[PDB]
Design a protein around this ligand. Structure first.
Ligand SMILES: Nc1ncnc2c1ncn2[C@@H]1O[C@H](CSCC[C@H](N)C(=O)O)[C@@H](O)[C@H]1O
Ligand SMILES: Nc1ncnc2c1ncn2[C@@H]1O[C@H](CSCC[C@H](N)C(=O)O)[C@@H](O)[C@H]1O
Ligand SMILES: Clc1ncnc2[nH]cnc12
Ligand SMILES: Clc1ncnc2[nH]cnc12
Lengths: 268, 257
């Protein structure tokens, strides 16, 4: 059917997206509380760390899809890829990453996440080295639209196809419905080499979330709907985990019921 | 002992616990080595009990980071009032407190239990019951009727004895004095400078008795200890900074018999 209308609503809504409110909502306490191991923050970092610790996810290049203003999702990844591409639809997010990349004071402070990543990776790495290395390995920050058949545009700067994809809380957060979600997943898959890996983190059964003035509409998906899409896009699912959001972390910034983590390998 | 009246805690903290000696990122540095010695020792599970006294804490807390989860009642001590105030500022989260968070983070890193550094600090602050005056040159270092529970199940002392003693014999007596605070069977974790004769703390120029690993060992034996472990870190050139003339650092794990 028609994708333009729904997508247009999505683009319109996001023009009001406030990175600082989003950061506050999802990455400052209580959700940003890395001290409780039962919290969502540690669960996120744990999924990534353990996945990369298998040694099975490696290569030269990685593309992070819909990075927004966050970098936690690359902390464990950055030791396994020489070349990392970050991306976002919104200029204000790309600028936010720009501040962190220049190590400015005004930048969001990710050091708790960096340290925690060092803690659970168990190699006694200090967090300053971790951060220095991610900053070195991020080779570009690009505009992206996952609804386009070529999400990075034509003749993009990105090394293609990539050995690996990371995407956290993007697809479900920018797709009006499941069909759109599936197509988004189809589009980003054209960027991954056959046999490459996709690490997909996202919200389960979420219909809305706030980022300042902007209230955004999210397609609520289930674990089984996420599995089907991955199969439908040509992936073998290696791992699919579910975190049930505790009530004390359900804060009125959204209606998220849980979080999913998928490690999928593109068939070919 | 009057020289210690000019001892500036911030200058000392700058000299030993800020970069380069303060950089914890390089595993071959003295900071990580010290934390490593403490952690490994406690990780054995052979150093346990209810009460612990830290001897000559100065204005530093790193020496108890790994210890605090093994002892519910902790006593910190120093000869100088200014050092006791500097400790108070960190314990009470006051303004101007020295930031020990790098060390707390590194202890959590080394200990490998998944603990966030804030929990670590929280526990340490909670278990430190009291900060007391002390003088190891006195037969009763803590004085007559101290608030400290005695005898302690364990002692810790870092860079104190050799730094307050003019010579080996004074060093030996100082050790005899603090040994009286320790329950028989108790454990002593002693960390200290090797072959050092002076160091600076702002306007203060302190004298140090230069001691060897073999001298340290013999002293512990003379005081009634069985040396369970004794290691040396040789101070690399890049950490020899004009603040002192230290050659190495010794770590000793001893058990009172
Ligand atoms: N059409 C589109 N194509 C690709 N990314 C988009 C998009 N529309 C919005 N986005 C980005 O999708 C993100 C959802 S928030 C996720 C932020 C980050 N990945 C983290 O894990 O929190 C926002 O940064 C938003 O700007
Ligand atoms: N006569 C005495 N008896 C017990 N402690 C003394 C003393 N004279 C000086 N001290 C304290 O011995 C300490 C030596 S340096 C501080 C060592 C600190 N524990 C750390 O590990 O870096 C100083 O705090 C000093 O004030
Ligand atoms: Cl933990 C969580 N829940 C809902 N939305 C999110 N976006 C990023 N993290 C999120
Ligand atoms: Cl590493 C080191 N060297 C000399 N004196 C010291 N006091 C505390 N740490 C010290």
């Amino acid at each position: 059917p028609d994708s333009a209308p729904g997508q247009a609503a999505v683009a319109s809504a996001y023009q009001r997206f406030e990175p600082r409110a989003y950061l506050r909502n999802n990455y400052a306490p209580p959700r940003g509380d890395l001290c409780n191991p039962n919290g969502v923050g540690p669960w996120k970092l744990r999924c990534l760390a353990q996945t990369f610790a298998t040694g099975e996810v490696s290569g030269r290049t990685l593309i992070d899809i819909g990075s927004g203003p966050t970098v936690y999702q690359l902390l464990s990844a950055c030791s396994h890829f020489e070349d990392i591409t970050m991306t976002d639809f919104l200029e204000v997010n790309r600028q936010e990453l720009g501040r962190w990349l220049q190590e400015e004071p005004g930048a969001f402070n990710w050091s708790m996440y960096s340290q925690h990543a060092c803690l659970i990776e168990g190699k006694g790495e200090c967090w300053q080295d971790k951060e220095r290395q991610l900053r070195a390995r991020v080779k570009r920050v690009l505009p992206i639209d996952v609804h386009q058949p070529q999400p990075l545009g034509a003749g993009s700067p990105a090394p293609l196809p990539a050995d690996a994809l990371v995407s956290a809380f993007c697809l479900e957060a920018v797709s009006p419905d499941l069909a759109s979600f599936q197509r988004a997943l189809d589009h980003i898959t054209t960027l991954l080499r056959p046999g490459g890996h996709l690490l997909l983190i996202g919200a389960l059964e979420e219909s809305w979330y706030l980022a300042g003035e902007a209230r955004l509409t999210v397609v609520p998906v289930s674990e089984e709907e996420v599995r089907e899409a991955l199969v439908r896009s040509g992936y073998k699912v290696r791992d699919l985990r579910t975190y049930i959001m505790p009530a004390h972390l359900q804060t009125g910034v959204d209606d998220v019921k849980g979080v999913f983590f998928a490690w999928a390998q593109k068939v070919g």
